[PDB]
A paper describes a structure:
[name]:[name] complex crystals yielded diffraction data to 2.7 Å and harbored two 1:2 [name]:[name] complexes in the asymmetric unit. Diffraction data were phased by using our structure of [name] from [name] as a model in a molecular replacement experiment. Two “butterflies” are present in the asymmetric unit of the complex, but only one interacts directly with [name], the other one interacting uniquely with its partner [name]. Thus, [name] employs two distinct surfaces for partner molecule recognition, a fact that relates directly to its biological role of scaffold protein. [name] interacts with [name] by inserting its C-terminal β-domain between the head and anchor regions of the PBP, forcing the anchor region to “sway” by ~15 Å away from the head. The swaying movement is guaranteed by the flexibility of loops 50′–52′, 203′–204′, and 224′–227′ that act as a hinge, opening up the N-terminus into a “V” shape that accommodates [name] snugly. Direct interactions involve mostly the head region of [name], which recognizes [name] through a hydrophobic zipper generated by surface-exposed non-polar residues on both faces. These include Phe169, Phe182, and Tyr222 ([name]); Leu69′, Phe71′, Tyr127′, and Tyr134′ ([name]); Phe169 ([name]); and Tyr134′ ([name]), forming a π–π stacking pair. The fact that hydrophobic interactions (more feeble than polar interactions) are involved in [name]:[name] recognition indicates that these complexes can form and be disrupted as needed during the cell wall elongation process.
Penicillin-binding proteins (PBPs) catalyze the two last reactions in PG biosynthesis (GlcNAc-MurNAc polymerization and stem peptide cross-linking, or transpeptidation). Class A enzymes can catalyze both reactions, while class B PBPs act uniquely as transpeptidases. Within the elongasome of a variety of bacteria including E. coli, Caulobacter crescentus, Bacillus subtilis, and [name], PBPs have been shown to interact with, and be recruited by, the essential protein [name], a bitopic membrane protein that is essential for cell shape. [name] (residues L38–L588, thus lacking the TM helix) is a 588-residue molecule that presents the characteristic fold of class B PBPs, with an elongated N-terminal region followed by a transpeptidase domain that carries the stem peptide cross-linking site.
Numbering used by the authors:
A (entry chain C): 92 to 248
B (entry chain A): 41 to 519, 533 to 588
C (entry chain E): 92 to 247
The structure:
């Protein structure tokens, strides 16, 4: 079981960072629980309540991380980012079969998002020997349309 | 100018594969929670409290202990607080760990043996680099994962691969700029073995309540399709260090699970040597395969009587029949007329003195007892009785199941296979026989044929129900009313198919109380090879 | 919701530049809230009430910054400036597709401006690896004239 509740941004946190936003408070959330953020049927980032302030850390922020699955065999990884602020799936098993263009969806195993929400598509693949990474394309980054109409993802803990 | 920065590129330890590309040994991607080295005692405590929350199944203090310990990483910085975390366990934790600034969670490899105790004595296991291991091969340091036993050890260099490195320009923020140098790591580190996973599972099934060892071998090139040693043990219990509880269980198991019985265990061969002994007679004396002599229940020579295995005795008998019926006196009699120097030469030529050359560590050589050997060990003379008891494979005579196997495939083939496990180990056949000896081989084969197929044969009542024609020799080695540990050990070796030999099989059941009793196990393996199309 | 309230520039604050102006006071504003400034249907800078004074920090000023969106895909950045005192959109992800000539509008996400107010057009684009910047043309440059019909942008 799971809830989507609407929310909206009041401002960016810094004016030197597009990946961090202040969100309008939402009645009885838990503090420090990590919530998912969804816009146009897509994952845009996560949200945490800290000292009474609801903060959104968007895709490619240092603090934005969550569990995703790739392709029809649901290959698992974790969302991070890199020095060029590209959205990356990290920590994939080296034996896994991934193809350029494979859909990437939330895995729904992290208690942040439910399963099956769209994230992006695999554009390239790095070998790091003990694991592989996948750089995404068609994922939310810098796009202003999806910062409106935003829903908070509350997965019952 | 500024300054530069180095980063090693450490390849994942190579996979071990079955004949048909099944996984025997592989790696599992797991996690590890790390804290930076050189931290204040006050802060360190507060971070361990945080890590306590995420792993409530560990104690606040067992995590102190882990901090300063003989573990660590390959890096100039980071210390492993919790290790071996399953991927699924990390699934709800990864994001929460990311929220805390000074806490890192990193991917690690843990070795994994899918089949557990299958072929445990072939594959062997990897462990933490001992301080002596780092000395042995300086390059063991970048992984801290080295083979301890068996194939993991024998082929460590291969499986581990070569490190590469990457040197980079950096700024004060210690971020990466240009790559200045790259050397890539090795990649094809995998290893394919000749075992067949199905055939080994059969082998395990056959030794289900038994101790001993079993071997199947392609007699034309030396590939081992089976190599069981029983009890086997579960390789996964060693991977993260062995527990005090499981080490006791293995050490104090009286049946001795850590023992490799096909390569690192010695047993008296018994009657299995007889075609090697016979071959020496024909070579050194003025006699033939058809030389027939009277074979009573026993003989007397001086002060003592050398007894045949069954009371009744065995009438008149030649070489063919002495092999067939595992007759003792034929060999007692001609043993009187052969010098131990010449007999032992023939036995050592057919592969009983030395290592077969198997690609594992520490293969045992046997003892082919002779004159000079008894003098060096016991300082006692070589009485005629020694020649005689040796001519039936007992007394001071010891061999490995490997030796018997190689020996059996020499008889059947006419050339000597080096047994091996690594398919990419091109081991040429060896030709330690002269013209005369090779011709006499057929005689010997016909005898082995008769053991399994003639109604008088020792192994007739037991080796029926076989889809192919078999040729064998039984044996028994001294240590129904008899208590288990006092019982004689049991041998049976064999080649197949008789009409054109290709494979050899060699079976040994500890306290198997008689060699003929093992025909039911031989058929089952030879049928499994039929079932699976090897024949 | 959003409001425009009129005011006008009375004088320049600094004697060293034209980037900073005094505005005619406006009743009941909140102190230290950052408001947007608009003139001929264009973004000219921002305004803050501090210690009873309504101060305008125009496009080129060190303190003037706000959120804008570029082109049809509404790529996000922030208004700043550079070593040559050019009006710049800064903080753009390097993987974004923006082109010379793209319209630049206020994003309306910053609580300063509403969306869609005109800022300028992209004239060039510098790639800095970690981010890119876009130098603007046809934007309001903070010049010699004291404007009479400026409106303050109050987002609630």
């Amino acid at each position: 079981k799971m809830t989507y509740t609407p929310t909206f941004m009041t401002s960016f946190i810094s004016l030197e960072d597009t990946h961090s936003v202040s969100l309008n408070p939402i009645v009885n959330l838990e503090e420090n629980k990590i919530y998912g953020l969804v816009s146009h049927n897509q994952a845009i980032g996560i949200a945490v309540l800290e000292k009474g302030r609801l903060n959104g850390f968007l895709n490619a922020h240092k603090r934005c991380a969550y569990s995703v699955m790739i392709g029809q065999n649901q290959v698992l990884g974790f969302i991070g980012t890199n020095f060029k602020q590209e959205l990356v799936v990290d920590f994939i098993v080296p034996s896994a079969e991934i193809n350029i263009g494979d859909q990437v969806l939330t895995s729904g195993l992290d208690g942040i998002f439910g399963a099956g929400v769209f994230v992006g598509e695999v554009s390239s693949i790095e070998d790091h020997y003990t694991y592989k990474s996948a750089v995404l394309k068609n994922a939310f980054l810098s796009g202003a349309k999806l910062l409106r109409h935003v829903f908070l993802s509350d997965v019952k803990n | 100018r500024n300054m530069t920065k180095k980063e090693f590129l450490v390849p994942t330890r190579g996979n071990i594969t079955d004949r048909n590309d099944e996984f025997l040994a592989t790696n599992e991607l797991v996690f590890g929670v790390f804290l930076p080295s050189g931290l204040k005692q006050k802060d360190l405590l507060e971070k361990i409290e945080i890590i306590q929350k995420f792993f409530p199944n560990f104690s606040k203090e067992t995590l102190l202990n882990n901090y300063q310990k003989e573990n660590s990483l390959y890096n100039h910085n980071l210390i492993k607080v919790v290790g071996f975390i399953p991927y699924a366990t990390m699934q709800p934790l990864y994001a929460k760990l990311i929220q805390t600034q000074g806490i890192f969670a990193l991917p690690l490899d843990k070795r994994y043996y899918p089949n557990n105790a299958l072929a445990s004595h072939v594959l062997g296991y990897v462990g933490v680099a001992s301080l002596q291991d780092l000395k042995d091969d300086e390059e063991n340091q970048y992984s801290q994962i080295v083979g301890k036993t068996g194939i993991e050890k024998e082929y460590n260099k291969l499986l581990q691969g070569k490190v590469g490195y990457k040197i980079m320009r950096v700024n004060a923020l210690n971020q990466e700029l240009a790559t200045l140098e790259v050397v890539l790591p090795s990649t094809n580190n995998h290893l394919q073995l000749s075992l067949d996973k199905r055939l080994q599972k059969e082998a395990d099934k056959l030794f289900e309540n038994k101790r001993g060892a079993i071997l199947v071998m392609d007699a034309e090139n030396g590939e081992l399709l089976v190599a069981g040693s029983y009890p086997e043990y579960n390789l996964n219990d060693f991977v993260g260090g062995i527990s005090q509880d499981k080490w006791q269980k293995l050490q104090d198991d009286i049946y001795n699970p850590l023992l490799n019985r096909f390569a690192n265990a010695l047993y008296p061969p018994g009657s299995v040597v007889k075609m090697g002994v016979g071959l020496s007679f024909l070579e050194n004396l003025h006699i033939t395969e058809n030389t027939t002599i009277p074979t009573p229940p026993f003989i007397e020579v001086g002060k003592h009587k050398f007894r045949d295995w069954k009371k009744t005795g065995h009438g008149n008998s030649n070489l063919y029949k002495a092999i067939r019926e595992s007759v003792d006196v034929y060999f007692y009699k001609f043993g009187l007329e052969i010098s131990i120097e010449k007999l032992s030469k023939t036995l050592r030529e057919v592969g009983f003195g030395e290592k077969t050359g198997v690609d594992l560590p520490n293969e045992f050589v046997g003892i082919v007892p002779d004159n000079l050997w008894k003098l060096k060990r016991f300082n006692q003379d070589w009485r005629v009785g020694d020649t005689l008891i040796t001519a039936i494979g007992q007394g001071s005579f010891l061999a490995t199941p490997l030796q018997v196997l190689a020996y059996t495939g020499l008889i059947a083939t006419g050339k000597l296979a080096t047994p091996h496990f690594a398919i990419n180990n091109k081991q040429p056949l060896k030709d330690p026989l002269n013209s005369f000896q090779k011709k006499k081989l057929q005689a010997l084969r016909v005898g082995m044929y008769e053991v399994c197929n003639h109604k008088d044969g020792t192994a007739y009542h037991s080796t029926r129900g076989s889809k192919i024609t078999l040729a064998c020799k039984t044996g028994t080695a001294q240590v129904k009313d008899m208590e288990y540990f006092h019982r004689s050990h049991a041998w049976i070796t064999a080649f197949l198919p008789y009409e054109k030999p290709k494979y050899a099989i060699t079976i040994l059941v500890e306290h198997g109380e008689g060699g003929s009793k093992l025909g039911g196990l031989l058929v089952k393996m030879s049928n499994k090879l039929y079932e699976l199309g090897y024949l």
